[PDB]
Amino acid sequence: FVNYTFKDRSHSGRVAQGIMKLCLEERLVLSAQSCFFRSMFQDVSESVFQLLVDYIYHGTVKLRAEELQEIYEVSDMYQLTSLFEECSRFLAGNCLQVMWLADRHSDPELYTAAKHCAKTHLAQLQHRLLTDIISDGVQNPTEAIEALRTSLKEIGENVHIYLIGKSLAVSLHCAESISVSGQNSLCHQITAACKHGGDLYVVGGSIPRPRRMWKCNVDWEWCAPLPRDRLQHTLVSVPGKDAIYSLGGKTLQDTLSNAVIYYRVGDNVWTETTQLEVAVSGAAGANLNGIIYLLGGEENDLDFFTKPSRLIQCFDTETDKCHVKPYVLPFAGRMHAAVHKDLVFIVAEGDSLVCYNPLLDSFTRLCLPEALWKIASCNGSIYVFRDRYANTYKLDPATSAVTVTKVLLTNLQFVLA
Amino acid sequence: FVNYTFKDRSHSGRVAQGIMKLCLEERLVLSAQSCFFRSMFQDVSESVFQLLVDYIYHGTVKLRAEELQEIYEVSDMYQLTSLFEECSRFLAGNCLQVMWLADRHSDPELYTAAKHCAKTHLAQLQHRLLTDIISDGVQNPTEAIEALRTSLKEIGENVHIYLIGKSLAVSLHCAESISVSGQNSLCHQITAACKHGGDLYVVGGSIPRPRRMWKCNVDWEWCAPLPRDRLQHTLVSVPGKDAIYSLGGKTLQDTLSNAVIYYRVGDNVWTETTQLEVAVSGAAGANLNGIIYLLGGEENDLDFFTKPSRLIQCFDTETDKCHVKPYVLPFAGRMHAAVHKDLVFIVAEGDSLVCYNPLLDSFTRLCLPEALWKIASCNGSIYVFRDRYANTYKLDPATSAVTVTKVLLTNLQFVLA
Amino acid sequence: KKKVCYYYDGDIGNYYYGQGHPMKPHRIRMTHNLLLNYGLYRKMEIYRPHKATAEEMTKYHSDEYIKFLRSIRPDNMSEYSKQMQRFNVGEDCPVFDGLFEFCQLSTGGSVAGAVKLNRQQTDMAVNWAGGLHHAKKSEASGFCYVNDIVLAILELLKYHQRVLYIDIDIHHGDGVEEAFYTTDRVMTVSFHKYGEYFPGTGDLRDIGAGKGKYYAVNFPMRDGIDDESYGQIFKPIISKVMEMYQPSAVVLQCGADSLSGDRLGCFNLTVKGHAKCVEVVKTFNLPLLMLGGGGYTIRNVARCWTYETAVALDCEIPNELPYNDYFEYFGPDFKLHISPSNMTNQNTPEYMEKIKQRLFENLRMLP
Amino acid sequence: KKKVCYYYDGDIGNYYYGQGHPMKPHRIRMTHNLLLNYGLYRKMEIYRPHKATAEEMTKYHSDEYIKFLRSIRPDNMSEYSKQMQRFNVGEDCPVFDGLFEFCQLSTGGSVAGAVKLNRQQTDMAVNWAGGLHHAKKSEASGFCYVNDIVLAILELLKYHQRVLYIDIDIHHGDGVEEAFYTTDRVMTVSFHKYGEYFPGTGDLRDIGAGKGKYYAVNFPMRDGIDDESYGQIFKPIISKVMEMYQPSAVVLQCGADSLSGDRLGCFNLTVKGHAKCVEVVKTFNLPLLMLGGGGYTIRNVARCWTYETAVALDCEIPNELPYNDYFEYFGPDFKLHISPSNMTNQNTPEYMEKIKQRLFENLRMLP
Ligand SMILES: [Zn+2]
Ligand SMILES: [Zn+2]
């Protein structure tokens, strides 16, 4: 009745909407977003500057594939806005040029993605950037160098993609086509699997105690069990923190779970962490920049049963906090995901595929060849596999053209990254 | 990889912060908040205009009691912003003047609050406004009229405040001091009570089946039972929708509940509705403009027990949706609340009292006379009561002065509005 | 035709539960007159439940518990104040005058009615004073002390192999289910409101354990189920259960607290709808024990039980109530039927259909 | 001194569970040698568990279940494929060669050890082949078929009035608790990890029912409890339980799956900490049956059980392991003790203190 502080949470919204309306229908707007304009208040084209001003005032940015270049350059010269971060992440055959672009514009995120691509395809493309490629690793390093010596490394032939079929797991190898180099059988049922750093981790065993975990790569190396018994729990790998996460899951009492646990390869321990806002089961996991996105699955319904979920949950690993997105997925039900650049290529139902960028709120769709697909991303390629044995296809993101690319498994249970 | 929409949720925040910084440290800002400034781009004072511009650019508004007048007038003439709504709600001896102010500025919310105050205190203060007071109701209507005839109504003597003590409930009557006119005993244990529209509703009975509900005013009129068995469930009255809500509660299985149900006086039925985000027990309820605020109580902890909760939950009755506030209460534990104007005077622990305005995010504190208080609001007065038998005090919101004002009950279980 | 047996003693009406008591046993007498006034009494056979001996109660209950209940009178609550916490008697279900005499008759109709029912004496036995199901082996739960249903079922198992127990009520029947949770001799189909309700038990997943693993059927429901939904879920479920189980003697516990307007319950069943269930069970033509439980709103309960008696007699009763002893309670309407309230039915057809499919699936594992 | 009895047969080591089997019974033989190599064998009395008759198993189990288990051989799984679903045998706990012969010995040590323990023959009986607690009355749960613990407890009740059962393990003991959930003759204190764990039972509120209402103590725990916390929660709780209960013969089920580094469990107990509990129970000087359950990481389990045998003998054993038959498994360390892992203890002192207060409160209602 005498003293109180009044904080209007809608002040920013009102002022932004009003500035948008008056400016569009008729220096502060730009200076409030870009430091360089603030300092000043040719390089960019009129068409690109149109989208630049649209982002300055309205913040509505759509891209076509042919403008990323400028959408990078200008967005790193005119401003340090989130536009630059999004365009650079989106940019993350063309590796040799993007290396130079990232080096010249000092981007420590595009540079590593480009070095990865260049090193993986060094054989197919055979100064300081060359040393960085060699130091990172590699498959003809010495031949490429001839075409100093101590600035070289080798990792043999790491498996590009794994896949569990029917019970043996095949270590598929990608050569720039597909190859089958490696094979090992398992005597255990696999509830979940994850590929950490070129190694296969598999969690399962009997259904009432599905905790046994193995590192089969002499195979059958036993690892620390999880303290929970959950089925269809999402298993994700985060080499950034060297941790393997197990989110969600369905308990043996037909009850959904919201618990989250994480493993440590170096310490060989499992540690519990923050719980999920909404319990889900069978959701597809996607690790983007350390943040785990849990997509789809099943959610509680009718107080006793489960319905196909269409929620998106976000687990921030750095802060260890969970929150549910305010928007909804295009579809619901059994789902498969695969991380590519800053996107998740999510596949569900039939002839359905959505490219989802979780930092933002939009889902795109690409036409399939109109045949239960399972997707898997590679160093720079997307491979779609049919649940039942063409058995494999290659998806070109730019043209959406499915091109048929050795399969010895009747069934396809898991297709790891 | 080809097409997606980029929506930056931080565009508004960035632009607002930048405009604030550049403007303060050095027309669009005002025009984006006020239509009248937009139209134009003496009445107000320089001191008031300082807070006006602070609201225009920064949105930081604190008031001292002596400026509401201008904070009303200007905020209704210069703009239709949320400032006018807040000042009018805050304004909602002085009734005869606020009536004229609301009439002249066409406020259909301040006007009814002022008519309520004027009608309640018509005896103590003995053209069209007079007819509105008479039509609303009243205790000497005819005497005041003499000091047309068909434009009058009477409601006898409605009970201002009820209170359950020790088991009989006393119908305390406020006369402009306290009076004791009315008394009725109960044979039942009272889990909760909600004096609704001048009538007493009590829910309880045996603890395993605490559903029995009574309308004792010949007393003991039976009402529709609730379909849930919960203890310390928050009972709230909403005459706006003519509905009595029962939120939260603790089950007989020592488990907290997040279910919400509501009664209908006209239809005499109980209907379930949306659940609460976080289950709480013993939380204090406050109905503000139809939105129910659940404050404090107990929350789950250690997977088996309960800890003093300090959360604020919001149940929007019009949309029937629940959400938890992003901020925290000053204290935690057993709590009591009482709605006054647009504020909630929340009392807990000892020598602690907070005036919390749920539309915003700020809590104030008033010093108590330094003695388990229970608060109760009247037409224009705040009465604090001691849990054990001075037994009653009157709180002046402006001066925070506790002034001692008939009590025949050793104990004080409930103090309804 | 269908021989019917009635059990009733007048004195049961003098067992005052206490001030502010939801449970009012005297309601049954306000029912008995509606049998006489309508004339159903002549066509029927009427008896009174005789005293149930302490030993008889010591068939499912413990000796100590029954001794405690028998030895507690209202004057001497002080001596047994310590034992009033071990047996949950005194607060939620307070002790009153002649409590043991009350259970001498509330239970006396179930065992002595099942005696005639199991033998070749009747196809339908009636006892509106019984219907007490919440009592535990050595504890008083709800408003029950001696579980007449469990005693009657045990007394029935002597003459029959498989016994189906149908619980038409709004409360889950805890005593009967736990008494027969781990046995295949008795399947207990219970139609009840589930959630944060009194019993706390009766989950859809509480399908049984041990040898009686698939011999415990529960149909959870929300508040306000209409007549049509209840009937359409009752007929097929019961038919499927009997087809898969082959019951020999079914025990129907009808609880008038399921009617619309009850002073404790929240269901929306009418008198016609409540009699639809008993007629449905009659279609199968098996021995039918009839226990009348709940019964809190004394007018609706009296009308419902008299109508159920009429259905048991396969007779016709006019809607216009004849001026009775308690007509003042019946009010201006004078009607024998009660119009359903305007409350919403929370049981959507998808929910009902899904639970029915789960129950059918669980029934498919019946050996 | 303290007479100790040992039970072991060599052939138990040939019961191969199956490819990829967490449970490896042969681990006990890798333990037996550590008793002989250390020399504990001479100071001790060593026996072998004799065959457990089918009738003997039909004391807590059903006749049909034991007949099914006895009549299923690996060649003829086809004939009994239908019954493999009613009894939960074949998938999670697959059938293998000589399964019944395996239970002839896993159970043969508990009943025949309790025979000596109840009589005036020993103060401590040991059986590392037993410790099977998840088996149900008529179902195989976990990795158990015949519940040796429940048979031993029943065989003990003949000579003793009150029997305390302590479950030192990471899994809640379902069979024992449900076998004695509704009786006051046996209190089952179970220290176990609770949550979304295998058994699914053992809630803090599962304190009992019926006559044994306050005779079921459970101490839920999270993953990674240290030695100090486990000991500081074990000694006072057990002391208070015995003071309020006066046990006559205690049954300690030690599960080496509670050790740090086990291939299934997630506790952080060391060998010293695990022997601290057995020594604590020894301080009270009551008959102590010792059932060795779990035991999945065969090295840690072998070392722990040999150390527990040493504690039972009140002897000293050097840390440096002598070159044994399976030294290659023990690896370069050669140490008899295992260093605890670096995992976090989720059991904060406030949580532990609160649960201890709840357990004390529940114990105060003991008649
Ligand atoms: Zn009932
Ligand atoms: Zn174990």
Residue numbers in the entry:
A (entry chain C), B (entry chain A): 32 to 57, 76 to 90, 105 to 155, 161 to 194, 204 to 215, 219 to 227, 243 to 261, 268 to 277, ...
C (entry chain B), D (entry chain D): 9 to 375
Quote from the publication:
The best map at 2.7 Å was obtained for the higher affinity sample mixing KBTBD4R313PRR and CoREST1NT2-HDAC2. The modelled structure revealed a KBTBD4R313PRR dimer engaging two HDAC2 molecules in C2 symmetry (2:2 stoichiometry, Fig. 4a, b, although a rare 2D class with one HDAC2 (2:1) was also observed, Supplementary Fig. 4). The mutant KBTBD4R313PRR was resolved to near full length, consisting of BTB, BACK and Kelch domains, whereas only the histone deacetylase domain could be modelled from the full-length HDAC2 construct; density was also lacking for its associated CoREST1NT2 subunit. Most importantly, the indel mutation extends the length of BC II and shifts the position of KBTBD4 R312, a non-mutated residue, by 5.9 Å to the tip of the loop. In addition, the R312 side chain is sandwiched between HDAC2 F151 and F206 to form cation-π interactions. Additional cation-π interaction is observed between KBTBD4R313PRR R314 and HDAC2 Y205 close to the exit of the HDAC2 catalytic pocket. Here, KBTBD4R313PRR L408, F410 and F411 from the BC IV loop form extended hydrophobic interactions with an HDAC2 cleft that features Y202, L212, P228, Y359 and I363.
Kelch repeat and BTB domain-containing protein 4 (KBTBD4) is the substrate receptor of a cullin3-dependent E3 ligase complex (CRL3KBTBD4). Recurrent indel mutations in the Kelch domain of the KBTBD4 E3 ligase rewire epigenetic programs for stemness in medulloblastoma by recruiting LSD1-CoREST-HDAC1/2 complexes as neo-substrates for ubiquitination and degradation. UM171, an investigational drug for haematopoietic stem cell transplantation, was found to degrade LSD1-CoREST-HDAC1/2 complexes in a wild-type KBTBD4-dependent manner, suggesting a potential common mode of action.
